[PDB]
């Protein structure tokens, strides 16, 4: 039962999420139109490839954590 979609500008960057090398991936996140690998843990928390050891409660929180991590840097597409 996937989280809702989202779309916002966070710290100057566009982050989007939607229900849909890696895994299944029943949800997709993008930072400025580049797909960000994210994963759901059994307890419902989320992580992304740029914050993989630090569970956050939602995919929007994972997107925001990625923007925080990137410090303005473009994301490269995953595998």
């Amino acid at each position: 039962a996937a989280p809702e979609s989202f779309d916002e500008v966070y710290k100057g960057r566009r982050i989007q999420g939607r229900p849909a090398h890696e895994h299944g991936g029943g949800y997709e996140v993008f930072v400025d139109g580049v797909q960000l690998h994210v994963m759901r843990n059994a307890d419902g928390s989320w992580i992304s490839v740029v914050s993989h050891y630090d569970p956050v409660p939602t995919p929007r929180a994972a997107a925001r954590a990625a923007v925080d991590e990137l410090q303005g840097a473009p994301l490269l597409p995953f595998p």
Partner: protein, 273 residues
């Protein structure tokens, strides 16, 4: 064939370790370790196949991965072994680990860039190639994303857990493996990744040579746990979908089983256990 506490290495040991790592990087071999690790971190999932992480095989998989890496170092300088980082003891940025003659320090506040030591981008000797963004320099923010490394008290509490692992054998599990990995509880291994920051907090965490010293100490703690719990052993032991059972082989090697990796003394000993 002895893995030593990083804090005890001699000058010559530090030098030969740094040089062997830099030569694996130059030859292109280092980056394929980074890539292998990122593929498993991106594919291991709680509801599906899981091998390198979030699963009982977290510990023997990283033991074999570190053995592959150590053998590659030894192919450059056969005197070199992986040191370990006891982060319950050496818990500040002033640890000699982080000195310019060893791994270098934390990154600057503006962009997290490591500015000293042999792996600083300015040396020309540590390009970050296998990456998830445009930044091609080693980054760290020691103590930036979590205030504290695990303490010895916290480690002891995990070492006291008698069951190796428990169904459902993933990030939701009780028992030793998941408490050591950190997805439940006081959090040991995951929190160290978060504490270093930079690439160590990401799926391409072996970009930072501290990766190997962190996992060598996680591997030591498994060995310590075995000593405290001689009546406990790897589980599951057969027929579990999506999970590597004791006598099943593991990817990517396909030729080795958790059973072949339980006893570290077949490959190395510690300075003190």
């Amino acid at each position: 064939t002895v893995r030593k506490n990083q804090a005890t290495l001699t000058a010559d040991e530090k030098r030969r370790f740094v040089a062997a790592v830099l030569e694996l990087k130059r030859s292109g071999r280092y980056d394929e370790f980074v890539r292998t690790h990122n593929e498993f971190i991106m594919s291991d999932t709680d509801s599906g196949e899981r091998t390198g992480h979030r699963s009982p095989s977290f510990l023997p998989w990283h033991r074999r991965f570190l053995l592959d890496f150590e053998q590659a170092l030894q192919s450059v300088d056969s005197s070199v072994t992986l040191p370990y980082w006891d982060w319950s003891a050496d818990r500040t940025v002033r640890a000699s680990l982080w000195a310019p003659d060893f791994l270098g320090g934390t990154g600057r506040s503006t962009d997290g860039r490591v500015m000293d030591g042999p792996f600083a981008a300015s040396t020309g000797n540590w390009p970050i190639n296998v990456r998830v963004d445009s930044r091609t320099y080693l980054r760290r923010s020691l103590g930036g994303s979590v205030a504290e490394l695990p303490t010895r008290a916290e480690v002891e509490s995990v070492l006291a857990i008698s069951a190796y692992d428990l169904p459902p054998y993933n990030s939701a599990s009780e028992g030793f493996r998941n408490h050591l990995e950190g997805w439940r509880g006081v959090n040991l291994h995951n929190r160290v990744h978060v504490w270093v920051g930079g690439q160590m907090a990401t799926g391409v965490s072996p970009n930072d040579p501290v990766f190997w010293l962190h996992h060598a100490y996680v591997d030591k703690l498994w060995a310590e746990w075995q000593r405290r719990h001689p009546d406990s052993a790897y589980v599951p032991t057969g027929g579990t979908p999506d999970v590597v059972d004791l006598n099943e082989t593991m990817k990517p090697w396909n030729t080795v089983r958790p059973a072949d990796l339980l006893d570290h003394t077949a490959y190395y000993t510690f300075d003190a256990l």
